[PDB]
Structures are given as structure tokens and as C-alpha cells.
Design an enzyme around this catalytic site. Structure first.
Site, PDB file in Angstrom:
ATOM      1  N   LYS A   1       5.511   5.014  12.034  1.00 48.76           N
ATOM      2  CA  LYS A   1       6.761   4.027  11.794  1.00 48.76           C
ATOM      3  C   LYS A   1       7.886   5.074  11.969  1.00 48.76           C
ATOM      4  CE  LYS A   1       8.531   1.367   7.871  1.00 48.76           C
ATOM      5  NZ  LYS A   1       8.250   0.926   6.679  1.00 48.76           N
TER       6      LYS A   1
ATOM      7  N   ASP B   1       3.665  -5.616   4.536  1.00 48.60           N
ATOM      8  CA  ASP B   1       4.547  -4.619   4.191  1.00 48.60           C
ATOM      9  C   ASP B   1       3.771  -3.683   5.152  1.00 48.60           C
ATOM     10  OD1 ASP B   1       5.654  -2.162   3.522  1.00 48.60           O
ATOM     11  OD2 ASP B   1       4.923  -2.293   1.543  1.00 48.60           O
TER      12      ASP B   1
ATOM     13  N   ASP C   1      13.321   2.578  -3.882  1.00 46.04           N
ATOM     14  CA  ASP C   1      11.799   2.690  -3.230  1.00 46.04           C
ATOM     15  C   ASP C   1      11.548   4.145  -2.932  1.00 46.04           C
ATOM     16  OD1 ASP C   1       9.651   2.277  -1.693  1.00 46.04           O
ATOM     17  OD2 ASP C   1      10.857   0.845  -0.459  1.00 46.04           O
TER      18      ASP C   1
ATOM     19  N   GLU D   1      12.888  -4.408   3.723  1.00 46.24           N
ATOM     20  CA  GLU D   1      12.030  -3.997   2.525  1.00 46.24           C
ATOM     21  C   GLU D   1      12.800  -4.162   1.342  1.00 46.24           C
ATOM     22  OE1 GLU D   1      10.774  -0.151   3.932  1.00 46.24           O
ATOM     23  OE2 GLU D   1       9.571  -1.054   5.394  1.00 46.24           O
TER      24      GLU D   1
END
Ligand SMILES: Nc1ncnc2c1ncn2[C@@H]1O[C@H](COP(=O)(O)OP(N)(=O)O)[C@@H](O)[C@H]1O
Ligand SMILES: [Cl-]
Ligand SMILES: [Cl-]
Length: 386
Positions: free
Chosen positions: A68, A7, A197, A173
Site C-alpha cells: 500500500k 478495507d 485512525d 477510509e
């Protein structure tokens, strides 16, 4: 032979291995099961993970994080223009339109593409797995957000190749979190899964459908700027005002080092508030050599964050509306991201879903790596998790 699941998170990364049908989330050098997605450059060394995050306040210009948010993007994109206000490090556009992160390393100006910074985080995660296994690791499954476009996915894959990984696959994800819970196997009929999330910097809600071991992302929504860091900022803003009332109007916010030190302690208190009714925020010699101390109850934290917590239900209602389905049709609600440990958020989601218990047995900041590890084992020919 050996394949790992990674991850590659906005704020934290996590590596897992699925062997004999069982998944081990691998602790790093400091015993941490997640590693900050931070890379720092000093006069002598290049720090990655915990060591990089730990010196961020003392070396803000040369400590890189949030890569990211830049990976696979053109520097001219409006999200870059907007996000860059949050970064103490310099980001400029190259002649190819790609972002270039500028740091000083060993007294020299160095520039890096976002995928080069992410490759350093991936290399650290690879090394974490290798130290645990005592053997080299070449194969990996890396996860990305469901909304990542082709350019973002490809740059993430390139980051893996630069790190020395043979990227078996890039997977979503939310799908990785669902795979972790065996919701593809345990059902075997039509199942609607909501992935909630809430991490350090982002909030993603994804509605999946699983018919015959096949996952499909039906709808996604969220807020790319809502996460644990925003709840820490609510505590920082409160403490800044509290310091003013205690010390004749003195403003801590005018000193960026004082704010960073206060933010570090606010985040620690927030975590304590997930399992205690009270926490202390203490910063010795915060500003003007004045010590700062305050006690925060869980109720006060819930009050400061009340709107932000409640607003997490808006993207939930949006995905259900987009997918043309009622909340009663959701079979499982999976809690992912470290911020889902906040009791108030768990209560709000449970109440929204009419008392349904969310799936939270796997440490929420590990569920994505856990699912990626399972997928990596399957793609390596190991059917033991089935
Ligand atoms: N016990 C806890 N209670 C509240 N928040 C917590 C927590 N444990 C971790 N967190 C928060 O989780 C966020 C990190 O989420 P995580 O899932 O690891 O990272 P990421 N890269 O997906 O953003 C941080 O803001 C951190 O404060
Ligand atoms: Cl393996
Ligand atoms: Cl082992």
C-alpha cells in the site's frame, strides 16, 4: 447480487457483508476477523495472509508487505526512497518508472508491481467472503486513505479488477468509518466528525462534515510513519538494552533474526497491556543460546511511548486549525485502527475533547470494512441498513 466491503489496509485487511441491514465481518480460515496484508513466496508455494506473516522471520527476502506504501507511486518518489530502508525485500524501478518487487518463487526470480501484490491480498479477502457465503462474490467496495491521489486510487481499483472483483466504488477510509456508525443517518442536521485512525503503520486524522447524508472531508493530517509498529519498536529497543545489562553487554541487535523474534513477542505483550496491568516478554534462546525474559507493566510501556502517544494530539489540533473550528464543535470522535485499543490513547483523546466519549463500539480494526460493506449494499440496491 452479492457485494462485499473490503478495507485493504497497510498491515491488515478486513472483509464485511451487509445483508438485511446487519453487517457481518467475516473471519478467515484461522478464525481471524482481520488478515495480514502479506504475500510470501517459498520453494513450493505462494502464501497469503496469516500463513505469509507467520513465516516472515524465516523467509524475509521473499515475504512482501507494505505494498500500500508503493501502490500507484513512481519508484523515484521520495516516500519510496525513505520507506525502502524498512523492507527486507528488494524493490527496483521498471522502465515505466513503476516499482517492481523482486522475490524468489520456486527457485526462480519473479517481479511484481505493487497492484499485483495488493490483488493477491484482495483475492484472499474475496475467498474469505466466498467460503463464508458458500457462493461466488463479484462486486466490492474498496476503501483507500482520503489523501490517496488519482494514481493511487486507480492502481487500487486495478488491483481489484486483477483479483476478479467488479469495483463498484473506491471510497475514503474516514468516510467508511463514519458510515459504519450511521452518523450520516442518525443526525440529519450539520455534524462535524473527527476520525482518529491509528493502525499498524500509519496515523490519519480526518475531519468530516455531514450535512443531509453527504460527507465532506474538510481537513486531513497525521503521520504516515506512526503506528503500532513504532510502539513495538519502543519495547524492542528497551529489551535490547535490558538484555545488555543482564548478559555482559551482548547486543541482540546485531542478529536480525533475534530482533524479529523479539519484535513478535513485544507486539504480543503490547496487546496484553491493553487489558492487563502487566505482561511478560519471553524469547527462548534469543541470542547466543541465551533465554530472555522480562516483565513489562502498563506504566513502563506508557513511559517508553509517552511522547509518541501525546504527539497523536498534534494532527488533531492541526485539522481543527485548518478547518477553522474549535474542538468543542466536534460532534463525534470515531476511534479506528487497532492501536486505538491502547487505554492511554483513549484517555488522551477523551481529555483533549473535554471528557467527550469517543465512538468505539465497533472493533476499531473492523470499522472501515463495516462501512465499506454498508456502502456496497446501498450501491447494490439494498436499502435495509437505512
Ligand atoms: N489490543 C491491542 N492493543 C494495542 N494494539 C493493538 C491491539 N490489537 C491490535 N493492535 C495493533 O493494531 C495494529 C494494526 O492495526 P489495524 O487497524 O489492524 O491495521 P492497519 N492495516 O489499518 O494498519 C498493530 O500494530 C497491532 O499491534
Ligand atoms: Cl450484498
Ligand atoms: Cl451466511
Amino acid at each position: 447480487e452479492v457485494a462485499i466491503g473490503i478495507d485493504l489496509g497497510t498491515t491488515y485487511s478486513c472483509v464485511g457483508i451487509c445483508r438485511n441491514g446487519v453487517v457481518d465481518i467475516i473471519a478467515n480460515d484461522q478464525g481471524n476477523r482481520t488478515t495480514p496484508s502479506y504475500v510470501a513466496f517459498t520453494d513450493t508455494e505462494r502464501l497469503i495472509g496469516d500463513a505469509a506473516k507467520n513465516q516472515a522471520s524465516r523467509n524475509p527476502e521473499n515475504t512482501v508487505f507494505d505494498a500500500k506504501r508503493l501502490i500507484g507511486r513512481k519508484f523515484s518518489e521520495t516516500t519510496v526512497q525513505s520507506d525502502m530502508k524498512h523492507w527486507p525485500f528488494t524493490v527496483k524501478g521498471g522502465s515505466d518508472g513503476k516499482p517492481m518487487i523482486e522475490v524468489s518463487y520456486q527457485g526462480e526470480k519473479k517481479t511484481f508491481h505493487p497492484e499485483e501484490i495488493s490483488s493477491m491480498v484482495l483475492k484472499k479477502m474475496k475467498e474469505v467472503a466466498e467460503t463464508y457465503l458458500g457462493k461466488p462474490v463479484k462486486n466490492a467496495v474498496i476503501t483507500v486513505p482520503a489523501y490517496f491521489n488519482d494514481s493511487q486510487r486507480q492502481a487500487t481499483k486495478d488491483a481489484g479488477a486483477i483479483a476478479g472483483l467488479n469495483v463498484l466504488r473506491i471510497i475514503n477510509e474516514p468516510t467508511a468509518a463514519a458510515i459504519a456508525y450511521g452518523l450520516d443517518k442518525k443526525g440529519k442536521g450539520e455534524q462535524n466528525i473527527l476520525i482518529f485512525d491509528l493502525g499498524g503503520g500509519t496515523f490519519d486524522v480526518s475531519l468530516l462534515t455531514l450535512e443531509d447524508g453527504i460527507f465532506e472531508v474538510k481537513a486531513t493530517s497525521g503521520d504516515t510513519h506512526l503506528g503500532g509498529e513504532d510502539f513495538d519498536n519502543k519495547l524492542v529497543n528497551f529489551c535490547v538494552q535490558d538484555f545488555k545489562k543482564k548478559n555482559g553487554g551482548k547486543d541482540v541487535s546485531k542478529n536480525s533474526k533475534s530482533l524479529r523474534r523479539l519484535r513478535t513477542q513485544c507486539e504480543k505483550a503490547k496487546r496484553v497491556l491493553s487489558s492487563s496491568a502487566q505482561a511478560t516478554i519471553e524469547v527462548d534462546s534469543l541470542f547466543d543460546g541465551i533465554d530472555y525474559n522480562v516483565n513489562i507493566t502498563r506504566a513502563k510501556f506508557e513511559e517508553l511511548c509517552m511522547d509518541q502517544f501525546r504527539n497523536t494530539l498534534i494532527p488533531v489540533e492541526k485539522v481543527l486549525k485548518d478547518a477553522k473550528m474549535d474542538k468543542s464543535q466536534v460532534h463525534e470522535i470515531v476511534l479506528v485502527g487497532g492501536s486505538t485499543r491502547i487505554p492511554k490513547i483513549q484517555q488522551l483523546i477523551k481529555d483533549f475533547f473535554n471528557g467527550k466519549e469517543p465512538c468505539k463500539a465497533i472493533n476499531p480494526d473492523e470499522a472501515v470494512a463495516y462501512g465499506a460493506a454498508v456502502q456496497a449494499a446501498i450501491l447494490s440496491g439494498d436499502q435495509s441498513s437505512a
